[PDB]
Amino acid sequence: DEANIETHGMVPMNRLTDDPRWLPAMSERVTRMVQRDRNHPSVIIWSLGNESGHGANHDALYRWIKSVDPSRPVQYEGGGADTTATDIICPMYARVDEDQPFPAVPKWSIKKWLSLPGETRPLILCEYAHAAGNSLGGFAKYWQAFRQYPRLQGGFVWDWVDQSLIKYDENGNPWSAYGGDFGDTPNDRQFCMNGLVFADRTPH
Amino acid sequence: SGIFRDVSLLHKPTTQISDFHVATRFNDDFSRAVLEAEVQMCGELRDYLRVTVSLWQGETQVASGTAPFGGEIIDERGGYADRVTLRLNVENPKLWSAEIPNLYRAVVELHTADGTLIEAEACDVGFREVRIENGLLLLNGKPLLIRGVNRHEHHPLHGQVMDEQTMVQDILLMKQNNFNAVRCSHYPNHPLWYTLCDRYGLYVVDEANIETHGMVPMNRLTDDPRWLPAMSERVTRMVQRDRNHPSVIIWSLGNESGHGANHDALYRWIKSVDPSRPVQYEGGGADTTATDIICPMYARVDEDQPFPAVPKWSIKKWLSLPGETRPLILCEYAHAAGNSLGGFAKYWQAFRQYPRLQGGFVWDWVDQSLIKYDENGNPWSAYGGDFGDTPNDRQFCMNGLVFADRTPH
Ligand SMILES: [Mg+2]
Ligand code: NA
Numbered sequence: 001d002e003a004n005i006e007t008h009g010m011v012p013m014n015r016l017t018d019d020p021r022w023l024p025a026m027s028e029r030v031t032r033m034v035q036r037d038r039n040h041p042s043v044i045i046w047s048l049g050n051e052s053g054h055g056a057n058h059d060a061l062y063r064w065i066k067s068v069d070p071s072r073p074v075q076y077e078g079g080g081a082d083t084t085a086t087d088i089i090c091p092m093y094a095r096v097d098e099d100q101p102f103p104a105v106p107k108w109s110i111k112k113w114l115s116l117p118g119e120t121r122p123l124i125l126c127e128y129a130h131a132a133g134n135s136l137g138g139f140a141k142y143w144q145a146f147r148q149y150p151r152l153q154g155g156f157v158w159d160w161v162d163q164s165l166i167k168y169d170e171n172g173n174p175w176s177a178y179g180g181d182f183g184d185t186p187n188d189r190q191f192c193m194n195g196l197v198f199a200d201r202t203p204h
Numbered sequence: 205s206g207i208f209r210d211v212s213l214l215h216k217p218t219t220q221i222s223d224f225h226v227a228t229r230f231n232d233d234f235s236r237a238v239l240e241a242e243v244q245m246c247g248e249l250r251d252y253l254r255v256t257v258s259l260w261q262g263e264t265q266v267a268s269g270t271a272p273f274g275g276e277i278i279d280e281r282g283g284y285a286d287r288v289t290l291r292l293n294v295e296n297p298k299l300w301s302a303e304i305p306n307l308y309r310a311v312v313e314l315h316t317a318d319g320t321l322i323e324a325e326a327c328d329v330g331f332r333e334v335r336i337e338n339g340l341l342l343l344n345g346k347p348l349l350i351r352g353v354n355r356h357e358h359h360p361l362h363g364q365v366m367d368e369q370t371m372v373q374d375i376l377l378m379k380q381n382n383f384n385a386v387r388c389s390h391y392p393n394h395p396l397w398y399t400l401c402d403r404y405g406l407y408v409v410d411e412a413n414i415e416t417h418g419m420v421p422m423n424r425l426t427d428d429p430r431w432l433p434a435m436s437e438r439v440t441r442m443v444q445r446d447r448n449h450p451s452v453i454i455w456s457l458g459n460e461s462g463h464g465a466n467h468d469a470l471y472r473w474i475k476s477v478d479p480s481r482p483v484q485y486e487g488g489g490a491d492t493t494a495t496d497i498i499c500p501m502y503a504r505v506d507e508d509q510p511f512p513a514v515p516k517w518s519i520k521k522w523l524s525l526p527g528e529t530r531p532l533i534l535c536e537y538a539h540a541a542g543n544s545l546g547g548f549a550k551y552w553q554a555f556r557q558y559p560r561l562q563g564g565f566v567w568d569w570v571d572q573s574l575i576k577y578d579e580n581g582n583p584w585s586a587y588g589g590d591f592g593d594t595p596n597d598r599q600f601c602m603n604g605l606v607f608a609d610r611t612p613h
C-alpha cells in the first residue's frame with residue numbers, strides 16, 4: 001500500500017520532501033492511508049510514496065508508521081533505494097549482474113547490493129523488467145538470481161496494463177491512443193504503455 | 205623425514221632477554237603512532253637492570269626508551285617483576301605494505317643502568333595496521349585485494365630443504381607476476397622466508413602445522429580434547445616465533461582437519477595473545493566460529509556446490525547469506541594442475557566488482573616433482589609412484605604455476 005506522494009519533476013527530486021513546510025501535507029497522505037487500510041490482511045508492506053528523492057520528511061513519516069503499526073515493514077525507494085527510510089532495499093531497474101554506478105544514487109547489480117559492507121536488509125525490487133512494447137528480454141535472469149539468493153526476494157514488474165485510451169475515427173471505429181493524441185502537449189507519447197497486458201486486458 | 209632445516213648453537217648470558225613483542229598502534233589518519241615493546245628477562249632480577257629499545261630508520265635513530273624491570277599491576281598479586289614495556293612515539297611513520305615495504309630496525313638492549321650492555325636482540329619493524337572493519341580486511345585503513353598464491357617448501361633436488369637462493373628466486377618471480385601475498389601451506393616455514401617477505405614486501409598467512417585430512421570424519425582428532433595439547437603447541441609456538449614479523453598479517457589454524465572444539469579454543473587463544481592479526485581457518489565449512497574470514501577452497505564464482513554439511517557456495521552468494529558479514533578470501537582457488545587456470549578471469553572480475561570479495565591464494569606455486577635419473581645418467585621429473593612408493597596419488601603432486609626448477613607454466 002503506497003502513499004499518494006510523487007514529486008518527480010522537482011530539481012533536485014527531494015526539494016519539497018526535505019522541506020519541513022511540506023511535512024504536514026505529506027504526513028496526511030501517509031497517516032490517512034494507514035488509518036484507512038491498517039485492518040486489511042492483504043497489505044503486508046507500507047510505502048512512503050514514489051520518486052520524491054529522499055528528504056527528512058521521509059525519515060519522520062517512516063518512523064511514524066513504525067510507531068503506530070509495528071506489524072508491517074515500511075519501504076521507500078527514493079534517494080538510492082537503501083536509505084534510512086526503508087526496511088527493504090527496493091531499487092527500480094537495478095540489474096542482475098551489471099552495475100550502473102550513477103553518482104549519489106547508484107543502481108548496483110542486485111547480487112552485489114546485498115553484500116555491500118554493513119548491508120543486511122532483504123532486497124525486493126519495487127520496479128523491474130520494464131514491459132514497454134516488445135519487452136521482458138532477460139526476465140529469466142532475474143528469477144534464476146531470485147531463486148539462488150535467499151535475500152533476493154523478488155520484485156514487482158513494471159507494469160500490469162497499458163495506459164492507452166480509446167478514441168474513435170470518423171467511422172466510429174475505436175483505436176488505441178497514447179500521449180499526444182488529445183492535443184495534449186508537452187507529452188511523452190507511448191511511454192504510458194508498459195503493460196504485460198493491453199488496455200482491454202488482452203495479454204502481450 | 206630427517207634434519208631438513210638448520211641446526212645451530214646459541215650462547216646467551218645467564219641474565220638474558222627471553223622474549224620480546226613489538227606492536228604498533230596508530231591514530232585515525234596514520235600520521236602518528238606508538239610502538240610498544242614488551243620485553244621479558246630470565247635470571248637474577250636486580251634493581252640495576254634496564255632495557256633500552258631504540259628505533260632506527262637507516263642510520264637515524266628516530267626514537268628511544270629506557271626503563272627498569274617491573275611491569276604495571278595486573279592482578280591482586282601484583283605484576284611481572286621480570287617484564288617491562290617500552291612505549292615510543294613516532295610521528296608520520298613510514299608505513300609498511302607489500303607495495304612499499306618500509307622497515308625500521310628495533311634494537312632491544314638488556315643492560316645495567318650504569319651502561320654495561322649484557323646482550324642485545326633486534327628485529328625489522330613494519331609499521332602497519334591489519335584489521336577487519338564493517339566486513340572488510342583493511343591494511344593501514346585501505347581494503348586489500350589479495351593477489352596470492354599457496355607455496356610449499358619444495359626443491360626437486362633437495363626435497364623439503366630450503367635455501368636463500370631458491371626463496372629469493374620464488375619471491376622475485378611472484379612479485380614480477382603481480383602476486384602480493386602468499387600462504388604458508390600448510391605449516392610454519394623456514395625462518396628466513398619471513399625475513400625475505402618483510403624486506404621484499406609480501407603479505408603472509410602463517411599457518412599452524414596441523415592437517416588430519418585422512419581421519420574419518422575429518423575432525424575426529426580436532427574435536428577430541430585429548431589432542432588439544434599436541435594441537436595447541438603447533439599453534440602457540442608458531443605465534444611466539446613469528447609474531448614480530450610485519451609480513452605476517454593473518455594467522456591460520458592449519459588445514460583440512462575439519463572443525464573441532466580444539467579449533468575454537470586455539471582460535472580464542474590467538475585473539476587473546478595477539479589482537480593485531482585476524483585469524484582464519486577453512487575447516488568444517490570455511491565459515492565456522494573459528495575464522496574471522498570466510499576462506500573457502502575452490503568455491504566457484506557463480507555456481508553453487510551444495511555439499512551436505514560443508515557446501516561450497518558461489519562466492520558472490522556466500523557473502524550475502526542471512527546474517528553473514530565477514531570478508532571472503534579463498535585460501536585455495538584456481539587449481540593449476542597441468543594445462544589449467546581456465547576461468548581465472550571470472551574470479552578477478554568478481555573480486556574487482558564485490559568489495560567483500562578480497563581475493564584468494566592460487567593453488568599453487570610449484571609442481572612437487574622430484575629428479576630421477578635414467579640409465580644414461582640423465583635427469584627426469586618424477587611424481588607419485590616413481591620411487592616404489594605405494595599407495596600413491598601419482599601426478600596429483602604437481603599443481604604449480606611453475607615447474608620444479610621454476611620455469612613458468
Ligand atoms: Mg645507547
Ligand atoms: Na531468494
Ligand code: NA
Nearest residue numbers: 191192193194
Ligand atoms: Na511509463
Ligand code: NA
Nearest residue numbers: 555558559561
Ligand atoms: Na573486492
Ligand code: NA
Nearest residue numbers: 600601602603
Ligand atoms: Na595436490
